């Protein structure tokens, strides 16, 4: 998980990777309530990483998150 | 619900038609009356449970639902006809409409076409023909929007069911059926998926049943969609979606040169500097790219006459990808694969006609590796012999390529 976190924290690659990650997670959104801790914990952590990345660069990532809000 | 199912299964072990009907006492008469009472409730789950229980009781007793419900029809019908349908809240209106729709489907003659039913049908038509602002005003609130969508869907369903009855609109000759079809067409261009699906289903059923269409009615129906396709700058995704839905509905009605006009629009939109600037970022969410992909999507729905634009579309896609520097991936790949999968023989022949060039074998190999390209794989398996024969001819021809 340190790879997505490193990619998102960096200023250069944050927008595109955040967009890709959100577009990917919005298809698996239905697995967040699967009752299997191993499966749901990873999804929750990925969502948390995406939202933290959105917070870091407010003026660049807000447009990326606007469609999915 | 599970406990209710179990109880109903247990009590009806040795049912017979005499015990489920009133005397000319019966065990299940009161139960059937009570269940039929709750068929017009404002909670959809209650209605579903009531109808499921009634059907389960009828099946075990070896009878027909209309036979069971004939005595008690008045208890449900009388209240509905006693009030104007345009004053009640949304939930009550929806429940009443659904109850009447279900009741008039058990058999053709269950609900006579008296004055009350006609008045109710005109009220439903007027409700379906209204506007979101008119219907109490759309404040953008979620719940009001959901209520409006559900009410429109119920009205469309009842009108579609009434269409199947040849009596409705025949004894009048006034513009009732034309108005019904116009309302269907208007609903097919809404922005809500449920109502769009309901309208599409009703329209396809009506078209199949009628087997023919007056020219004026279809001209009026098709005018709005073609109205917006006369300006590249004003092209939007919704218009293309409406056009695709119409093409899927009316297969053998449209004509050629719409594809050429769309390709001209695409060339207009694809400005060189615009693409050069669009590169260096994630353009998958840009509006122009979405418009271009929507335009590309239509080609796989056109009649067989569209077969002659394969080279043009492939060249356009490859040039666009070259401009954006993309490979293996782009928004235009999915509709292109969908279209190309419909003419396996033609695409195979065209690709094998240019085996020397390296830019086309790569593209075909990329296409064939997708999970959804199965017909092309079948054709390739069939004609591997011809493929090897042509490649052997090329190699033995004695060239440097």
From TrEMBL, chain B:
Highest rank taxon of the organism: Eukaryota
Job of this protein: Serine/threonine protein kinase which activates checkpoint signaling upon genotoxic stresses such as ionizing radiation (IR), ultraviolet light (UV), or DNA replication stalling, thereby acting as a DNA damage sensor. Recognizes the substrate consensus sequence [ST]-Q. Phosphorylates histone H2A to form H2AS128ph (gamma-H2A) at sites of DNA damage, involved in the regulation of DNA damage response mechanism. Required for the control of telomere length and genome stability.
Subunit structure: Associates with DNA double-strand breaks.
Family the UniProt entry places it in: Belongs to the PI3/PI4-kinase family. TRA1 subfamily.
Protein name per Swiss-Prot or TrEMBL: Non-specific serine/threonine protein kinase
Native source organism of the sequence: Chaetomium thermophilum (strain DSM 1495 / CBS 144.50 / IMI 039719) (Thermochaetoides thermophila)
């Amino acid at each position: 998980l340190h790879i997505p976190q490193f990619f998102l924290a960096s200023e250069a690659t944050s927008p595109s990777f955040c967009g890709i990650l959100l577009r990917f997670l919005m298809e698996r959104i239905e697995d967040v309530g699967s009752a299997d801790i191993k499966k749901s914990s990873i999804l929750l952590r990925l969502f948390k990483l995406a939202f933290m990345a959105v917070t870091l660069f407010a003026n660049q990532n807000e447009q990326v998150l606007l469609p999915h809000v | 619900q599970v406990t209710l199912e179990q109880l109903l299964a247990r009590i009806t072990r040795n049912a017979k038609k005499q015990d489920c009907l009133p005397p000319p006492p019966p065990r299940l008469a009161q139960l059937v009356m009570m269940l039929n009472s709750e068929l017009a409730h404002m909670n959809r789950h209650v209605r579903a449970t009531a109808r499921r229980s009634i059907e389960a009781i009828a099946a075990a007793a070896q009878a027909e639902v209309w036979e069971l419900l004939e005595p008690h029809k008045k208890h449900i019908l009388g209240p509905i006809y006693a009030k104007p349908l345009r004053a009640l809240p949304f939930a009550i209106q929806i429940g009443y409409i659904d109850a009447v729709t279900y009741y008039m489907s058990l058999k053709r003659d269950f609900v006579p076409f008296d004055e009350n039913l006609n008045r109710l049908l005109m009220e439903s038509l007027a409700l379906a023909d209204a506007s979101d602002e008119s219907l109490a005003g759309k404040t953008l609130e979620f719940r009001t929007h959901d209520f409006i969508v559900n009410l429109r869907v119920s009205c469309i369903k009842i009108l579609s069911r009434a269409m199947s009855f040849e009596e409705f609109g025949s004894g009048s000759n006034n513009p009732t059926r034309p108005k019904v079809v116009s309302v269907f067409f208007k609903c097919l261009y809404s922005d809500s998926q449920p109502t769009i699906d309901a309208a599409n289903d009703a329209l396809k059923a009506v078209l199949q049943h009628t087997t023919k269409l007056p020219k004026d009615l279809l001209q009026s129906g098709l005018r709005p969609v073609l109205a917006s396709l006369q300006d590249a700058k004003r092209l939007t995704v919704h218009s293309l979606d409406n056009l695709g839905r119409l093409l899927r509905l009316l297969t053998t009605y449209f004509k050629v040169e719409i594809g050429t006009r769309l390709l001209e629009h695409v060339k207009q939109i694809a400005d060189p500097n615009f693409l050069q600037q669009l590169s260096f970022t994630f353009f998958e969410q840009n509006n122009a790219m979405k418009v271009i992909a929507a335009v590309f999507n239509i080609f796989h729905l056109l009649p067989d006459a569209a077969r002659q634009f394969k080279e043009r579309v492939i060249d356009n896609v490859l040039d666009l990808e070259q401009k954006l520097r993309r490979t293996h991936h782009s928004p235009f790949r999915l509709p292109l694969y969908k279209y190309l999968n419909k003419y396996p023989s033609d695409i195979w022949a065209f690709t094998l006609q240019k085996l020397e060039d390296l830019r086309y074998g790569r593209f075909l190999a990329q296409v064939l590796r997708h999970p959804d390209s199965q017909v092309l794989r079948d054709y390739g398996a069939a004609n591997v012999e011809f493929i090897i024969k042509t490649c052997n001819t090329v190699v033995v021809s004695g060239k440097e390529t």
